[PDB]
Every structure is written in structure tokens, then in C-alpha cells.
Amino acid sequence: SGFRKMAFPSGKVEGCMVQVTCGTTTLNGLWLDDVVYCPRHVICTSEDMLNPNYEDLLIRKSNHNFLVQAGNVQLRVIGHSMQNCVLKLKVDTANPKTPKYKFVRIQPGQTFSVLACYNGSPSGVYQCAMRHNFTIKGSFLNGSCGSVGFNIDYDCVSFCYMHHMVLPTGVHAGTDLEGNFYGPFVDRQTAQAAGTDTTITVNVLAWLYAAVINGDRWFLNRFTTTLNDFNLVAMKYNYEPLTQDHVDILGPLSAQTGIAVLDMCASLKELLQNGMNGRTILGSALLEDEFTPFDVVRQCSGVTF
Amino acid sequence: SGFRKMAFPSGKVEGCMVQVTCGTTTLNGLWLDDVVYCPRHVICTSEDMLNPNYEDLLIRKSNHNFLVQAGNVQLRVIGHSMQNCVLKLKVDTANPKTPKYKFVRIQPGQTFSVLACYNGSPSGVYQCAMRHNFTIKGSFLNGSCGSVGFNIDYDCVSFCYMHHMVLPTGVHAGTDLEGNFYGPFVDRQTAQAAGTDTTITVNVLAWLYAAVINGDRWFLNRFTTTLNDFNLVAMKYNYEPLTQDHVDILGPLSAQTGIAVLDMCASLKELLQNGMNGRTILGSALLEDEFTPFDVVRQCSGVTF
């Protein structure tokens, strides 16, 4: 079977990427129906981004100050509005490639596929996870703002993320498609700090079940533990405490493998207290937390979209 | 900037995936122009795959024994031929989504994007590398044969791989788009063995340059070495010996970072002899070899397609 970090097919999202220019700044936009979405710091100069009054900066902008290009075609902007931290440019033409789509705000631990773009052209795709402190470890350069993160449920494209900025620690932050930032961040060039990032515990547990499926079992110990005792060990190691909801999610994996949920927590307790001793699990020398329980069954059962 | 394992946008390849049925076996096909490509073991039963006379098995097959479905549409097969290990089904309709494409046979160490499919529908995309023994560590289930590996150069899709089988050691093997197998493998259910897999040395060296670009430098030692002396250390550690061609490829990275090529080899010699001591490089506790020097500059300069 094998296990790789997989992303959804980006075919539907590529047809919705446009180039947005306003003055001397250019970023990518999401063209769905007759509305174009993009970050609001496109109306900023290099000196504006230090500290911006986006309201005052937007007063000085009309419809013709926005250059929207769809490939080699130009879209005529007939209206603009600021919803939180995103612009909504009203164009006179509907996108003929608009798929079944919907806007969703995700929770920490959930995974999505990012389509990194520059000048409105797709450059690549990779898998990411909303971390505990509402940041991601993405791959973004200058001009990548407007790149979107999404999930695919058969033919429906659930858009959940749009890139905005990078933090001093190299991690990235962004908003949903309504403009609300994931985390306590703001769109300014100010030293901002993400808080303490704890490991998604349920994601590591689901990843261990994927290892048992593909043959890695050296870590299966024959011990048990309680949630209250395992959580007290997980708190020393900066891990998410486990709830009954996390156990119920890992139910299908617990029944498919015949390994109890609390039994797997005992193996994770030993992996934290004893390290790994130079071994690997699924080809990795670290506990991997980018994989939701749905990501494990989707790859171990072959769901098509 | 960040550094992730990135794959090309799969938008152009999704429109070329069809479902091919022959008797009781169904796999995926590559529909370019008026020709459909697919593995030849589709004309096999479960008992045939033990030891197959593909010539005798193909004599008993006519044009109407092949069911080709493009989404909800059926393509009429008007001809068939066996080129090595792939079938070439002649359909009466050209694919209106055919991109600029070309067939290429790649060398060990080169990377490509795999679009895993089932029933002709894309399920996901990930990055792979042709290993030293002409195998890959992919993610394939039953029915994934016909999934293709490709690279994208702006608008040209270079197809290089088509899945066929999995080995006893969980690794996978396949052919190019002409039917010739990468490696000494054959399309039979026989115990087959891949040889000794050595680490792509130039790929690890280019990955270390990507670490210096993004800020990881704890491994920069202030030693030097010769190629003849570094290769003798690399031979003990099952690494590819280094040539002047590998040095010339790492030239641009060597000039961009100001770190000499032979200087970086001295740091890799220390990383092999001393281990990693619980540290990480770009978030990994292992030396990563899935990244060609082109993959590093494409992600560190933001090339668009």
C-alpha cells in the first residue's frame, strides 16, 4: 500500500486562479462566479505595510485601479468591498470553470491542500495541517499571497485558507475565505508571535495505525494505560490532551486493526519516554502529526474524487 | 520561504485519465490524442497473473473486449497493439483535452509527480523519485495500475512512468510510456528482488543547500575534503559516489550560498560519521534524498507553470 503525504487533485482550483494588480503590488486571486477574492494588502505600498489604515487606503481606490487578468484576458471590475481582511472585486463575467464550492473554517489538526501560485499561475501543490497555534508550515515566497487551501469531497471544493504573511519563525498565517484570520494575527509588518504549538495527539495516533496497516509494528508494546495517566505524560511532552471524542474518531481504526485505543496510547507513551533509538516508523525518525484519521482511511482504502 | 515536498499541478493530467475494462480486470488508462495507453496485464485473470503468455492471451481478444470509459462516455475501440508491456488501444475520438505532451525515460535520482487513480478518477498527487535500483516508494492500492508519473515544463507534460506492480518489500515498479520496465522487473506475480538501493548523494547535497537558504546551518562544519576521500567514506555508508558532473550541477547552488562544493561534502561526511544527535534539518531527523538540484531552485525561486 505505502503511505505518502498526499494532496487532492488541483484540477478544479487551477481554473479559479487569476492575477490581481493594484498599483505596484501584484498577488493571486480566487475567481468564483462573478466575484474575485484576494488579500486586502494589495492596495498597499512598501511603506504602507509598516502600519496601514486599510479604510483610508481603500477610499483612494476606484474600480479601474484594480487590474484583474485571467490568463491573457482582462476582467472588468464593476465593484469592490472590504470584508475583514479580503477584497471582493465584482467582475462583469462569471467564471465558466466554477465548480461546486463552499467556504469553510477548519479547526486545528485538520489537513488541506495548498496550491501555491505566482502571478495567477499554479506552481505546485502540497499537503498542510492547521497547527495548534493556528499556523502552518507552508512553502511561500514573495507574491504567493492569494494562494488558497482547500479540500475536495468528490466534486465539491471546500475552500478553507488564503495565504497572507510569514512570521519571524518562518511559519505562515492566513485567513479563511471570509477574511477572518486563523489565530491572533493581523495583516501588518509587525513582529508578531504565534503561541506554544502543541502536537496534535490524535493525528500521531492515527498515523501509528497507518504504520500497523503497512507493516511497521516494532512499537506495539503489550502495555495499557488510562486517559488521565496518558494525558499527564502528554502534558510534559507538549502534546494535546485526549478526549472521548478523539477516541470515538479512532474507533474504525481501532476495530480494523484489533488494537485497542488505550493500548495504542501506551505505545505512544513509550515512544515519548524512550525516544526512537535510531529506528523509523513509515520511513520517518519523528512522530508525524500531519495526518488526520480521515487522511489515513482515505489512503488505506483508496477513495476517488 | 519554507521547504515542502511539492508536486506539479495535476490539472492537465486529470483530463487524460480513463477507465479501461477487459473481462474481470479494470485499471486506469492514459488517453492522449486517439490512443489509449494502459498496462497489458488488464487482459489477465487472477490465475493468468501467476505465469502469463501475453501473446497467447492477446490472440483471444478483439476490439470489443475492451471497455474504455471517459467519465460517463464510452470510447469505441477500433484497434489494439502490444508495445512491450503496455497496450495501445486505438479509439475513434481524439481527446479534446490533450496537452503538449512527450514521452521521456528518466534516470535514477530524478523526481516526478504521480497522480494516483482508481476507476479512471484522480484520488491524489504526490512527489516521487526514481531510486538507485529503479524502484519508487509510492502509495498504490489495488486498481491503481495505469496511474502515471509526469513532470511539467510550463505547458508541456513530460510523461515518464506508469504503475504496474508492488514488490515483496513494499516498494513499487513500473515502465515508461513505451512499455519498457525501469529495472530488471517483469509483469508476473513472481517473487522478484530489487537490488541494493544506494542513496542519491547529489540529491542530499542539494537538500542541504536548501537548508542553508532557509536558515538551518548547525551542520556547516569548517572542514574540507577531496572527492576521492569523500567517496571512500560514502562507499561505506551505501551512498552514490560523486563525479565532476554532480559538482557542476551543484554549481549555481554553490555560488548562490558562497559554500564550496567540496566544503559541503565535508559537512556530509561528518553527518554520516557522527549521526544527527537528535537534531533536525528542515524538520527531518534523516538525510532526505527525494530532491534534485532543480527541485531546490524551483522552490527557492518560485517557477510558475
Ligand SMILES: *[C@H](O)[C@H](C[C@@H]1CCNC1=O)NC(=O)[C@H](CC(C)C)NC(=O)OCc1ccccc1
Ligand atoms: C504576500 O505575498 C506575502 C507572503 C510572504 C512573503 C514571504 N513569505 C510569505 O509568506 N506576505 C507579506 O509580504 C506580508 C504583508 C503584510 C501586510 C501582511 N508580510 C510578511 O509576511 O512579511 C514577513 C514579516 C512580517 C512581519 C514580521 C516579520 C516578518
Ligand SMILES: *[C@H](O)[C@H](C[C@@H]1CCNC1=O)NC(=O)[C@H](CC(C)C)NC(=O)OCc1ccccc1
Ligand atoms: C495493478 O493494479 C497492481 C498494483 C499493485 C496492487 C497492490 N499494490 C500495487 O502496486 N499490480 C498488480 O497487481 C501486479 C500484477 C502483475 C501481473 C504485474 N502484481 C502485484 O503487484 O502483486 C504484488 C506481488 C507480486 C509478486 C510478488 C510479490 C508481490
